[PDB]
Amino acid sequence: STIEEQAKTFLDKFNHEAEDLFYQSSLASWNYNTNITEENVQNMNNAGDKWSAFLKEQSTLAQMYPLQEIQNLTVKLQLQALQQNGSSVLSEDKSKRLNTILNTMSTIYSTGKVCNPDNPQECLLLEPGLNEIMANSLDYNERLWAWESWRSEVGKQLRPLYEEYVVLKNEMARANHYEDYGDYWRGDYEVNGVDGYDYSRGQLIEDVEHTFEEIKPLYEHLHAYVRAKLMNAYPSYISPIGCLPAHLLGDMWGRFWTNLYSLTVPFGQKPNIDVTDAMVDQAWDAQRIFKEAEKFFVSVGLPNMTQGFWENSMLTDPGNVQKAVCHPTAWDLGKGDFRILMCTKVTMDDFLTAHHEMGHIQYDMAYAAQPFLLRNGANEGFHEAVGEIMSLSAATPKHLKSIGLLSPDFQEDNETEINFLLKQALTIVGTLPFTYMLEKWRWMVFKGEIPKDQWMKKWWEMKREIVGVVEPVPHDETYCDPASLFHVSNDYSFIRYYTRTLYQFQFQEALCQAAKHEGPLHKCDISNSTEAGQKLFNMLRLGKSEPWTLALENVVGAKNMNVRPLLNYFEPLFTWLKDQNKNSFVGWSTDWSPY
């Protein structure tokens, strides 16, 4: 006869009634993804509509229960996750126009149009096109042409659409008892009602800034090295004091610097550790890949895969008889059925993606012992970092030679180590300043520190000060440069990748010092160590039942987001970069617009 008991009864009823509906929706989505037909999409849409209607119906009944008369933390968290109004505190016309704007921006981004001049054809879509033109080409002219065409044709076309989107999102966020939409996006890292472990929502900005201030030296050295190696490839196009151009970063937006490894490789005569040809020389297939992944996971302490996992997963492309999306995904249906959708080839990248997806599945099976509203990761960065640390620990030469791929007589030269560290740097640290700049720009454009004008001006001034990127063509206040990405054109958060990057190295160091491993961190294998397995399982059980700070303290021993593990990981490369940049200029300067 109290609010707590009524809330617990309602929560039990909801947890019982929502599991079957979510399982049916997930089953329909699986049948669609594994079989692209006109009937499966209809069933998927029907199941999605039913689940959305059920979730919206179980939101006004839960809205009647107040949150200030509850002493149990689990019930409070479940109700706070359930009483989320979201897009309901608006008007009919307002919500309809917002959905229309979102859908039309998504369609404008998904369609795309190359439409080269003096050519009535060859106007390609987001399929192979500008991607490989900006990725594996060395011509300045065509790179600049593509970077200008994608930003002028699928760019400024979304300027008023994005303005109205920002206005409507700010209206929704202010009407939802919150600050600007940036606060609504940062609300995921908020922890209240716990003594000592409380994490303010505004402290995330300060933490990200303090971590970036310590990342700055490594990124400046990496930028200097990349610029020095790029001046030898693009003569009379980049100054050794200025900033790097935008269209010479091996990507349309400059997010990842993976395509610059073929140009910035220090020891071009030393081959990598690619064991792709070693697997085809013997009986290896997707089944063997996943068996080796299960063997790696069971060696740490994690349980075996479920029986349905092997008889329900689509580990191999069925061929042309039926069409299926070959994007590697880990499916959690919700009723003990865990399976992976992946067209696993006999390559090494797929061998690491298998470990990534199996780490996702292990996290899911770990937190599957909690209520439905809490069966999710602590933050939006833990779930991907759990697989990223496994992919890092499984890509080491020790594990490769222990499984049987690499020859036991293989010598571990330090040149290959420098090359691997530089590749990891280009693929990890290269996106940290970009992510930070993009997320700070989103936060300042949602809060209001940037007026309706001066969007691109301050965007480029930040991309010059924070990042080492400079625009090749002067863009006025009419172009829409930031909206050329996928996450911004579809209303997705971006700080999750930064948090995942900062958490994966902390997890690696914590699980490596627990396994009593000596030497550098980049060659540490989490294998045949049950202590690290138990330490990680103590964190994978929590999910959303406990704050993420408590999970970090339980798995690492810190209550904040530290960056020292990343520096400890990249120290062997940091010293080499310091020794190589002795006869060059470190850092970058502004006022070098290539106009």
């Binding site: 009864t9 309602f10 349905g308 009723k335």
Partner: protein, 272 residues
């Protein structure tokens, strides 16, 4: 002549038990409406149930599984019902949860066994098997071996529930979702509970003892349906009455017994 032998004999073992119909039943009841079947007058052979390697959980409380065929009882109750796999552990003495105190509870002291096996082969259809239900809400905990079929709507708030659902008026019965693709733990597990009791009444179900090889020309130790002694069993000619089992000569001495299986009569002579 010292006796050294064992010819312990007992009559034939017929009408074993309806265990074959209570275990291999095609249809099972829900957990809130578990069926209690009376197993009273039949020779329960627990060896075929313990030796069968098709049961996941086989835990006998208050009695050893090997000594089940060495005791006599009056009535045996078989409670058959289907429950989820992850909550089979709740069917045990002293355990708590949701199915124990609201659907079916066992006493703190229990003299019996629990048998459960995975039934995902037949109790599962593509699209969902919503035929089995379970009681989710109650105003008080259930008593040991208590069954409740009342389907009145629950009342969690101060507002009276006038026969219809509302703010805090929920339906007491909730359905189970059993798909053939579910994992272990959510699959249906047909669990049967056997209860053994002893009261002031003649025991009707005992352990089935079948027979032993018969020796008819040596100094043996015999046991004919409770009798005992020592002697050689020579074939006699005393035609007993259709109901008389063992005969006694003058001075009240057991000198002739009838074999309970072949119904033949034979004399008992003391050994030299």
């Amino acid at each position: 002549v010292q006796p050294t032998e064992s010819i312990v004999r007992f009559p034939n073992i017929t009408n074993l038990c309806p265990f074959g119909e209570v275990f291999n039943a095609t249809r099972f009841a829900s957990v809130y409406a578990w069926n209690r079947k009376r197993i009273s007058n039949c020779v329960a052979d627990y060896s075929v149930l313990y030796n069968s390697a098709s049961f996941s959980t086989f835990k006998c409380y208050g009695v050893s599984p090997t000594k089940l065929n060495d005791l006599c009882f009056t009535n045996v109750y078989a409670d058959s019902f289907v429950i989820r796999g992850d909550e089979v552990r709740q069917i045990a003495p002293g355990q708590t949860g949701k199915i124990a105190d609201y659907n079916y509870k066992l006493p703190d002291d229990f003299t019996g066994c629990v048998i459960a096996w995975n039934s995902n082969n037949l109790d599962s259809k593509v699209g969902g098997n919503y035929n089995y239900l379970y009681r989710l809400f109650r105003k008080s905990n259930l008593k040991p071996f208590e069954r409740d079929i009342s389907t009145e709507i629950y009342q969690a708030g101060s507002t009276p529930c006038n026969g219809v659902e509302g703010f805090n008026c929920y339906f007491p019965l909730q359905s189970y979702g059993f798909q053939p693709t579910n994992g272990v733990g959510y699959q249906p597990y047909r669990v049967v509970v056997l209860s053994f009791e002893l009261l002031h009444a003649p025991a009707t179900v005992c352990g089935p003892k079948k027979s032993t090889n018969l020796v008819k020309n040596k100094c043996v130790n015999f046991n004919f349906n409770g009798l005992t002694g020592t002697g050689v069993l020579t074939e006699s000619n005393k035609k007993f009455l259709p109901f008389q089992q063992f005969g006694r000569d003058i001075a009240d001495t057991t000198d002739a017994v009838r074999d309970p299986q072949t119904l033949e009569i034979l004399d008992i002579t003391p050994c030299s």
